[PDB]
Design an enzyme around this catalytic site. Structure first.
Site, short mmCIF file in Angstrom:
data_model
loop_
_atom_site.label_atom_id
_atom_site.label_comp_id
_atom_site.label_asym_id
_atom_site.label_seq_id
_atom_site.Cartn_x
_atom_site.Cartn_y
_atom_site.Cartn_z
N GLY A 244 0.82 -1.20 0.00
CA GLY A 244 0.00 0.00 0.00
C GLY A 244 0.86 1.25 0.00
O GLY A 244 1.86 1.33 -0.72
N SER A 245 0.52 2.19 0.87
CA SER A 245 1.10 3.54 0.81
C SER A 245 2.57 3.62 1.17
O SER A 245 3.21 4.63 0.88
CB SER A 245 0.36 4.52 1.71
OG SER A 245 -1.03 4.59 1.36
N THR A 246 3.09 2.58 1.81
CA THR A 246 4.53 2.48 2.10
C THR A 246 5.43 2.41 0.86
O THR A 246 6.64 2.55 0.99
CB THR A 246 4.89 1.29 3.03
OG1 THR A 246 4.56 0.04 2.40
CG2 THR A 246 4.19 1.40 4.37
#
Ligand SMILES: *C(=O)[C@@H](NC(=O)/C(=N\O)c1nsc(N)n1)[C@@H]1NC(C(=O)O)=C(CC2=CCN([C@@H]3CCNC3)C2=O)CS1
Ligand SMILES: [Cl-]
Ligand SMILES: [Cl-]
Length: 502
Positions: A244-246
């Site tokens: 995801g956003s990582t």
């Protein structure tokens, strides 16, 4: 009548230590009692005292010996002390003998069970490092020639043909002090957030060493009964999840490397959604119009990173993610280690370009994610991963340009320190940098934080993964980020890293 026979001499299995020589797996002498049925069959009146002494019902013991009356070897009981294993011998039953054997003990128990793994009843590697490094650890058994009488009883030790050679010591990259800290704090975090499971990985960004690797749930490798399959999984290496956003800092690296973007550039993300045909990209917070590139990461705007991705093209982004090792084989050779999947295209469509950029539809392990952040932290240079102590550091590969890496590092420091950022990831006395992630699973979520410190001279990278926490509302930097703060604080102190936020 009687035969000369060759038999094995078992080898002393090698000690596993942590990086500083603390014992993690030790071959310890234990007393084993065995018997020769052919001899026992001449002394049946002794059997009940022998059964009683071994806590066995008299009849069941008798049946066992009668059935094996032409064999020459059975175990009575293994893993006794010298005091216990002579207490039976004091009875002087014909055909009953004691031997010292080697079996593993794990002094740190559950704290490093997933990394170290274990041996089986025969003292051969079955899981974790014990399996992975079995040849190194096992050594070679010796060989003795032996005269056995009519019953199989050894009457002469005629000559030793081959001496046994012990296994080699193995020093892991793991620092037991960091491992304990990580273990405790991950456990405490699951309780406070009501979570099902989790992982924590700590890496040295300069050497490629895995300094800590822990998961919940875990198990005692010294007491393996009622053992669940789920508890045995080294989830940091054998479970895959969507990052995801990582992954957004890697999308940003591609953007800054393209020549088309600087941190102060603006993207319009109003009204917090973006349609691509049937698919609709949706931001967690949807009261923004213009955001700068740091703001996109602070707000974790999927729409913002998607629009950057359209401008620079998915190919540049894929390449950064590939080069930093996401969805790529680590080369560690850990049993059951997964590679995951970074999808590729000959020609990237619009929808897939967006989803790649915010880490949707990608599959990684916690070790991969930590390794990717280590590259970023190490001014864009990836040093190969190691589960063993690294004395001579191998050459790294420059995967992101140093200036781009330094610019993204600065942006991730602002993600942690700036107004509206992930304030709970802040590490007392240091500047820290990182990125939060929240990933849907298909109501059920994974909370993620990946980062490094000290922000101005990076030493340590860390990934925290918390599987299905029980918070109704927004995780809001309050689930995985405080675990990063506590474990990073402790790790920097234990490694005597000078504070940079005095
Ligand atoms: C990046 O992590 C983004 N998350 C996603 O878009 C995902 N679902 O929300 C997602 N990506 S891949 C996949 N399988 N799913 C953005 N980041 C964050 C964040 O910074 O933490 C989000 C916040 C967030 C989403 C759900 N949240 C609560 C979970 C429990 N109830 C709501 C939450 O805090 C999403 S956008
Ligand atoms: Cl909103
Ligand atoms: Cl969080």
């Amino acid at each position: 009548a009687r035969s000369v026979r060759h038999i094995a001499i078992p080898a002393h299995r090698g000690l596993i230590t942590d990086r500083n020589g603390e014992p993690l797996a030790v071959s310890t002498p234990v007393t084993t009692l065995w018997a020769n049925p052919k001899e026992l069959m001449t002394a049946k009146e002794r059997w009940p005292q022998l059964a009683a002494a071994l806590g066995q019902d008299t009849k069941l013991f008798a049946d066992r010996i009668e059935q094996n009356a032409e064999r020459e070897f059975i175990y009575l009981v293994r893993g006794l002390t010298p005091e216990q294993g002579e207490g039976v011998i004091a009875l002087k039953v014909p055909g009953v003998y004691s031997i010292e054997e080697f079996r593993r003990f794990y002094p740190a128990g559950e704290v490093v069970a997933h990394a170290v793994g274990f041996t089986d009843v025969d003292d051969r590697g079955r899981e974790g490092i014990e399996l992975a490094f079995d040849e190194w650890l096992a050594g070679v058994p010796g060989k003795r020639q032996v005269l056995k009488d009519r019953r199989g009883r050894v009457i002469k030790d005629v000559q030793v043909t081959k001496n046994a050679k012990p296994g080699k010591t193995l020093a892991l990259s793991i620092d037991l002090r960091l491992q304990y800290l990580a273990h405790r704090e991950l456990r405490n975090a699951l309780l406070e957030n009501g979570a099902k499971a989790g992982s924590l990985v700590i890496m040295d960004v300069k050497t490629g060493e895995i300094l800590a690797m822990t998961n919940q749930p875990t198990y005692n490798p010294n007491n393996r009964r009622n053992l669940q399959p789920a508890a045995m999984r080294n989830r940091a290496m054998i479970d895959v999840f969507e990052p995801g956003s990582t992954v957004k800092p890697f999308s940003m690296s591609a953007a800054l490397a393209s020549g088309r973007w600087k941190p102060s550039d603006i993207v319009d993300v109003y009204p917090g959604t973006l349609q691509i045909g049937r698919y609709t990209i949706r931001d967690v917070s949807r009261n923004s119009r213009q955001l700068d590139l740091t703001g996109i990461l602070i707000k974790s705007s999927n729409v913002g990173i998607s629009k950057i991705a359209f401008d620079i093209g998915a190919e540049s982004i894929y390449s950064v993610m590939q080069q930093v090792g996401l969805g790529q084989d680590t080369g560690l050779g850990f049993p059951g280690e997964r590679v995951g999947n970074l999808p590729n295209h000959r020609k990237w469509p619009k929808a897939e370009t967006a989803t790649l950029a915010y880490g949707y539809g990608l599959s990684v392990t916690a070790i991969q994610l930590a390794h990717a952040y280590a590259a970023l932290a190490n001014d864009g240079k990836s040093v190969p991963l190691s589960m063993t102590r690294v004395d001579r550091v191998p050459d790294g590969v420059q995967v992101i340009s140093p200036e781009v890496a330094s610019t993204v590092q600065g942006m991730l420091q602002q993600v942690v320190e700036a107004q509206g950022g992930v304030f709970r990831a802040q590490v007392p006395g240091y500047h820290a940098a990182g990125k939060s992630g929240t990933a849907r699973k298909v109501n059920a979520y994974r909370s993620l934080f990946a980062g490094f410190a000290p922000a101005t001279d990076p030493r340590i990278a860390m990934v925290v993964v918390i599987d299905e926490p029980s918070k109704a509302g927004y995780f809001g930097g309050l689930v995985s980020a405080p675990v990063f703060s506590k474990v990073m604080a402790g790790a920097l102190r234990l490694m005597n890293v000078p504070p940079d936020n005095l």
